Paper text:
The catalytic domain adopts a (β/α)8 barrel fold (TIM barrel), extending from residues Asp82 to Lys427, and a β-sandwich domain comprising sequences from both the N and C termini. The β-sandwich domain contains seven antiparallel β-strands in one sheet, with two contributed by the N-terminal region of the enzyme. Based on analysis of other clan GH-A members, the substrate-binding site of [name] is predicted to be positioned on top of the β-barrel. Inspection of this region of the enzyme reveals a deep U-shaped cleft that houses the catalytic residues. Thus, the candidate catalytic residues are Glu238 (acid/base) and Glu339 (nucleophile).
Our data show that this locus orchestrates the degradation of 1,6-β-glucan, and this enables [name] to utilize this fungal polysaccharide. The critical enzyme encoded by the PUL is [name], an endo-1,6-β-glucanase that is displayed on the bacterial surface, allowing direct access to the intact glycan. The enzyme showed no activity on 1,3-β-glucan, 1,4-β-glucan, or 1,6-β-galactan but was active on the 1,6-β-glucan pustulan, producing a range of oligosaccharides in the initial phases of the degradative process. The crystal structure of the endo-1,6-β-glucanase shows that substrate recognition is mediated by shape complementarity of the substrate-binding cleft and the hooked U-shaped conformation of 1,6-β-glucan, rather than through extensive hydrogen-bonding interactions with the polysaccharide.
Residue numbers in the entry: 36 to 62, 65 to 495
């Protein structure tokens, strides 16, 4: 205990979200980072991970108390790290236990939540809500029902495929109804959907489930059906555009995907902003979009670790992920950060043919005991945000000490606490002083570390 609460993680695991504390120093010093609460940037919604079918199946195979302890650690603000934003699929994802939608039988009248929601998703989200009742939930479809597809806008004949195709414009109003019924069926279970996107990775035709949707199609779906139908149903649910990569998969016509939709006033009126993933391109794109459309929101919604980037090796992952995913997106105006599967087993699953089969969880659980859990970089990068940066916090400017290896972000929470998150990507420890303009503290910041700080303003 003391004036300043600290969480520390080192890439060597000499520290592992280890708790510490210091008190304010009275009365002048070198290597000082100063918070300027007067210069305010975006307001923060939250941070967390995806609650997929696989994640739920793995949680549900644990002993109840063990499951509840893990969810508490993860999601409780007062007794854990306070993960504050989750992402789920509308119908299946590539980490569902099958390919399905909530209207597989032709006709929108047939709409219903399926066994995956009833048996896996809903019971897990209810336990999460019991722990953290204000958690934000964003959702997206991986595919529309198969009968709503055509092969292409050129060839408007049915495509009976979980992957590829485009949305038949004749079904835009019925697909919008699908979203409304889905949001409403979740609300009847006690779950508020905070936001949606129209389609996960709309420029991807592969995966185990997908639907190709160019910006012109998403513009039209939103302005003519999804926007108006959600508003008429009285939904506060926000809509984010895009939900794909920074480089737009190098498809010339689709560059500035969300910006092109914003320039249609009728579509733009329904759009909070844009969601991004980081599987291609450069995060500078976030600053480019923010500068072009500064009244539109940015959200970071998906990234992965796996066999392609030594995802289990924290000595290779922690620094880079905290830089690029966590503080790199937030310092480029993202209002939250959400990684992919919260939990997969040590066999990278369960998973789907055509989907990712080389992915690791934010944590991995051992499928011999459903007890032993190892945290991977994603769990740390999120917990380092969510433990100290609470919903409604405002990101604020910092000035003073920097060098190569030092990255930081500072915030002011609505409760009158400041929060500071600091990467020291240098082999050596650094005695850093942190000042809020009125009081200051100092701390021996370990090498190759992430440290998170929280303290009361005077």
């Amino acid at each position: 205990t003391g004036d300043v609460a600290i969480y520390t993680t080192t890439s060597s695991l000499t520290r592992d979200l280890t708790r510490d504390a210091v008190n304010f120093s009275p009365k002048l010093a070198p290597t000082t980072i100063t918070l300027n609460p007067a210069e305010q940037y975006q307001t923060m919604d939250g941070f967390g991970a995806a609650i997929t079918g696989s994640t739920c199946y793995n949680l549900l195979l644990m002993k109840p108390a063990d499951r509840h302890a893990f969810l508490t650690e993860t999601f409780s603000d007062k007794d854990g790290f306070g993960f504050s934003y989750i992402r789920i699929s509308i119908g299946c994802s590539d980490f569902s236990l099958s390919e399905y939608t909530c209207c597989d039988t032709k006709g929108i009248e047939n709409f219903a939540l399926q066994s995956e929601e009833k048996d896996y998703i809903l019971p897990i989200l209810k336990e999460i809500l019991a722990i953290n009742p204000s958690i934000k939930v964003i959702a997206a479809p991986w595919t529309c029902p198969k009968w709503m597809k055509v092969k292409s806008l050129t060839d408007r004949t049915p495509l009976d495929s979980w992957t590829n195709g485009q949305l038949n414009p004749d079904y835009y109003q019925d697909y919008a109804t699908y979203f409304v019924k889905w949001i409403q069926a979740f609300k009847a279970e006690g779950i508020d959907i905070y936001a949606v996107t129209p389609q996960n990775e709309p420029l991807n035709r592969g995966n185990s489930a997908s639907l190709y949707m160019e910006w012109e199609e998403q513009r039209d779906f939103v302005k003519t059906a999804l926007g108006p139908q959600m508003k008429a149903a009285g939904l506060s649910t926000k809509i984010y555009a895009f939900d794909h990569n920074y480089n737009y998969d190098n498809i010339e016509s689709q560059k500035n995907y969300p910006g092109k939709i914003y320039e249609d006033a009728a579509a733009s009126q329904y759009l909070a902003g844009a969601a991004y993933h980081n599987y291609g391109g450069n995060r500078e794109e976030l600053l480019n979009i923010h500068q072009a459309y500064p009244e539109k929101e940015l959200l970071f919604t998906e990234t992965s670790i796996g066999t392609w980037n030594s995802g289990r090796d924290l000595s290779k992952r922690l620094m880079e992920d905290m830089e690029e995913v966590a503080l790199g997106t937030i310092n480029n105006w993202c209002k939250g950060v959400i990684v992919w599967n919260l939990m997969l087993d040590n066999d990278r699953g369960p998973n789907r043919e055509g989907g990712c089969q080389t992915c690791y969880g934010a944590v991995d659980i051992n499928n011999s005991d459903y007890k032993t859990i190892i945290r991977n970089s994603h769990y740390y990068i999120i917990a380092h945000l969510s433990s100290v940066v609470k919903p409604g916090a405002v990101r604020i400017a910092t000035t003073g000490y920097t060098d190569n290896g030092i990255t930081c972000s500072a915030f002011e929470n609505t409760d009158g606490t400041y929060a500071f998150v600091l990467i020291n990507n240098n082999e050596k420890s650094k005695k850093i002083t942190v000042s809020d303009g009125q009081r200051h503290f100092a701390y021996d910041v370990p090498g190759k570390s992430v440290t998170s700080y929280r303290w009361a303003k005077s």
